[PDB]
Design a protein around this ligand. Sequence first.
Ligand SMILES: Nc1ncnc2c1ncn2[C@@H]1O[C@H](COP(=O)(O)OP(=O)(O)O)[C@@H](O)[C@H]1O
Ligand SMILES: Nc1ncnc2c1ncn2[C@@H]1O[C@H](COP(=O)(O)OP(=O)(O)O)[C@@H](O)[C@H]1O
Ligand SMILES: Nc1ncnc2c1ncn2[C@@H]1O[C@H](COP(=O)(O)OP(=O)(O)O)[C@@H](O)[C@H]1O
Ligand SMILES: Nc1ncnc2c1ncn2[C@@H]1O[C@H](COP(=O)(O)OP(=O)(O)O)[C@@H](O)[C@H]1O
Lengths: 52, 136, 804, 65, 48
Amino acid sequence: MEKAHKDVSNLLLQILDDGHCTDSKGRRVDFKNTIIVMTSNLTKNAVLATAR
Amino acid sequence: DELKAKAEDAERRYDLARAADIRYYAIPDLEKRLAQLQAEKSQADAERADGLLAEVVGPDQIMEVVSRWTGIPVSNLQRSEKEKLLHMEEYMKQHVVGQDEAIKAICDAIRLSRTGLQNRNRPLASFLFLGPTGCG
Amino acid sequence: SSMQFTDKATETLNAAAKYAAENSHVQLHPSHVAVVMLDEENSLFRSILEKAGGDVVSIERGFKKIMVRQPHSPELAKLLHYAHEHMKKQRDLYIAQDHLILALADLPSMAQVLKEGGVTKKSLENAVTHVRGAYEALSKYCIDLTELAASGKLDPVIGRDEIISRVIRVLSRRTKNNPCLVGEPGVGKTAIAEGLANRIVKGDIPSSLQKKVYSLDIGSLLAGAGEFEERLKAVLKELKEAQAIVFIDEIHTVLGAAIDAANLLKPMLARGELRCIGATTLTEYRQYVEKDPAFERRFQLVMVEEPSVTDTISILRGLKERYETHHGVRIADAAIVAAAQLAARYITQRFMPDKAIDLIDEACANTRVQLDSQPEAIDKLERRHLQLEVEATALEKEKDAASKQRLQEVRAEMARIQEELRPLKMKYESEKGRLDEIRNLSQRLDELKAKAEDAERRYDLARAADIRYYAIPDLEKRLAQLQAEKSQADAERADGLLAEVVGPDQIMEVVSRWTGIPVSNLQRSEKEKLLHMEEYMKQHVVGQDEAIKAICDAIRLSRTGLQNRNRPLASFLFLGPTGCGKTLCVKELAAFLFNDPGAIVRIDMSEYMEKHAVSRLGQLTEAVRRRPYTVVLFDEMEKAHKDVSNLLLQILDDGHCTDSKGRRVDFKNTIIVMTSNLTKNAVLATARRHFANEFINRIDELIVFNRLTPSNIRKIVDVRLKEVQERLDEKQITLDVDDKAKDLLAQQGFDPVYGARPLNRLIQHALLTQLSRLLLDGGVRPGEIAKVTVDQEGEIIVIRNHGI
Amino acid sequence: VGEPGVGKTAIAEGLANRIVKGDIPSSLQKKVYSLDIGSLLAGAGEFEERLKAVLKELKEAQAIV
Amino acid sequence: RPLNRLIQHALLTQLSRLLLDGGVRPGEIAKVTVDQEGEIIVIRNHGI
Ligand SMILES: Nc1ncnc2c1ncn2[C@@H]1O[C@H](COP(=O)(O)OP(=O)(O)O)[C@@H](O)[C@H]1O
Ligand SMILES: Nc1ncnc2c1ncn2[C@@H]1O[C@H](COP(=O)(O)OP(=O)(O)O)[C@@H](O)[C@H]1O
Ligand SMILES: Nc1ncnc2c1ncn2[C@@H]1O[C@H](COP(=O)(O)OP(=O)(O)O)[C@@H](O)[C@H]1O
Ligand SMILES: Nc1ncnc2c1ncn2[C@@H]1O[C@H](COP(=O)(O)OP(=O)(O)O)[C@@H](O)[C@H]1O
């Protein structure tokens, strides 16, 4: 989750706030039971400061 | 079940005297007899030390069909919810050995959003795996 | 049975009697029908006879000699009887001009002239086969608006006096005599032409205009096949010889295109032999009218502006009686004003008055179900009595020692419910036939008012004299008596007072359902919100005492009337370091003034920094049109170029932005907030140098944030821990924190070099972490007051009382 | 509005149970009818004559479909 | 430039507060004088 622009970054922000995304067909899938995990690569104090 | 289906037609066919005989006499009499036979049958299960079982449809019967279609045994589904989150940090350390400070932080965000300490508008947990790869 | 004749076939016998009246005649002979058909433009009686041969001149001269020998004719009665008997014989095709040929061939008096002229009887069979395969076409393919307007079957038009009067001036001109109601799908376009037809019968139109109004149906002309040319040319021919104005709904779909249909309307509108009234959308108006220079020469731009909140109230007063008849309810006067004010401040689906009528239709329909299907206040007592009555009867038939004791407890609770259910059940049975009678007595009076007005307008003072003077005055006493006895009986039940009269509380229920805003937030007026605004912001945002007062000083000056209507609500420019209260202050603004935290759009400058994305500020223009009361947040304003600030200059100066589709979005009631991370005197002068000298002067308040003081840290932990206890009130768990634990977390999380972000993370990784640990093993049980104090080694720990 | 599988046929079937019972307002009684498209195409303009007769019977009787 | 902001942050600020609670009724004459402290204040003409 680092090889993309800013289109998919702003779409995933509303999931962590409202809890559901706006579907193109017209649905509101509630993400209250779906965990969100990511994988990237950006002692341990200087590593997390790069991804910020 | 026959009197239950016939009682629905009484409220539609405009029958006040007919509905007063089913919704006030047929239902109570048919429910007391069914509940009486269930209590007398359960008393004979302990007087023989091997009574007729395999009749109470519950967690032991619903989980058996799912276990055959998927593959996960029934013993992995009959566990309590309040007991799985306590031993969750100890089960992940069996195969993954080396990240003693990372596995403990995983259960900190899951056990907090399931006890009312987190807003319901947010998902379960939000993680961000960083650092070099190959750790797990 | 009954026969059905078209308007063209009906006027055929009338036109034949007019020609015979000048030649001194007392009866109408069927031979006069063939004479009228031979004097029309592109008639069908001549082309059909040409295929079979014969001599039409010998037949035409033979029919003219029969009418001279004449002294309802007895021979005409046989023609009307044959049209009714042979109306169920052949196959398809109704009645028209070609079907009347076979009716004249069956008459013995007309068959002798045909046989002696040329075309015999056998030639008429093969002649009508090859040709096979308001007037005539104005009845099935068109709908006359003046007919439904004079018959009392049209909704009143109130509030369009400034638009209808302008269309009359356009039709009276020599050139550009084709009005086009250019507007939007929601401001009203078809109802505008409805009021013009009302002034035609009354006589309010000038003498220069005497035409009619015909609604051209687009879907009716496309019924079937190829064969579209025979249906379109028939409508234009009937409108030329009759001189009438046709109305075309959505002209962008029929004029400008699959099957070519706009080519038949260009020569008619150019020679002045046709007058059309357009009503399309401005979006498609610039692609079908302004594109062709020949269309602009005949069409005139007529703008349709959406009415304000003052005219919308008068619009609902006209359609108030229409809903009081169908719904059978009483609409109060206070619900009309509140409907026009709540239709543009919370929900927005169309425009005025379209977005205001649905609130009255939905509110009046909710009372229909809540009264005939037993109200909730009455059904609640019946459901509780049904569960106790079925249980008491089961214990009476069972003789047991434990059944007699349980029956006494059920009977004690059954007598209390039955004491209050009988006065409500017996009253509901009497009000069932009385409330349904009001709707039955109102729908009949509505139809009598329509038939009474139709007779007075069609010169018939013999039928309407028994309706307005007898059928109506004798029925208003019974309808008013049932409405007075019903309102008095509702007060005796002490419940369901707002279940039959649509009032202010009834309109707020529909708005609260179509969004999610609680009812308690709807009753709060706009005047009381500006008074208790400073006390609400201090409860969530502390430390910035000089910034909260500056926000209210820029909003109160725009609502009273001390500033011109050329700027939005309040333009802000937040500065200071990060983590000082730039994002939380924006979220708290919409939760009090807008009553919608989710209505805050976020347009980041990470993707709109390029010059190609400047025109999409458009995506931002279209987004704010759907939701008027929105919060536009400008994050990372320091990274924006000069093209962004130049586009927002016309918004704060003219009050609106130039839309790409020619629309106009109102930017008067829209807040303008920004976010930037640029002692306090040199910080403010830095932001004024990067931007232009004019953009910084237009901004009202220039709030400059500062770092958090150590004295305000103690207040942060007092209001942050309160939200944790509020989320645990559902489990009956009281969270109490002593003064010792409130001072340890305040001296460790103090980090002014970054903001208040590491502040709450230290509490969650210590206080909130160990609190959820005891909620799974058996430490803290739902129903015990928890205690959090400081231990002996200095660590936030939760005091437990139960083991594992 | 819904995907073919969420339950749309039972909505019209459950509404007919409340019509005969009396849960609907007596001032405006409706009747539920099922317009099957398979029986209308059993002949052959046959479809234009069979469908027009069904819609006429619903306007003079005040009922849904 | 500071003159346009001084008349709004002193004379127009206290004037808008009286128009929201009941200080200046529509139909009276507003009087703005200088008090003994030294600040442009808006004197109301209505009881609290
Ligand atoms: N404790 C372990 N024992 C054995 N294999 C492991 C262990 N931890 C990680 N691995 C292996 O290392 C690999 C890491 O793959 P990874 O880089 O995560 O793939 P991706 O980049 O597609 O997510 C896995 O395929 C896994 O098999
Ligand atoms: N003066 C008025 N009084 C009552 N209703 C009006 C008035 N003006 C417009 N309307 C309503 O606005 C609606 C406009 O409908 P129409 O022009 O067909 O499409 P659109 O809703 O897209 O404009 C009409 O249904 C009418 O009831
Ligand atoms: N006045 C305040 N008192 C206590 N906490 C605050 C205050 N203002 C902001 N916060 C905290 O700051 C967080 C939001 O920070 P944010 O405004 O996004 O920082 P930035 O302005 O750097 O973007 C919130 O979680 C809130 O708890
Ligand atoms: N009494 C009922 N209770 C619950 N679900 C029902 C009931 N009656 C019908 N359904 C559901 O409605 C669905 C109807 O399916 P079907 O008629 O095939 O297509 P559609 O879902 O489009 O109507 C069924 O899948 C069934 O599960």
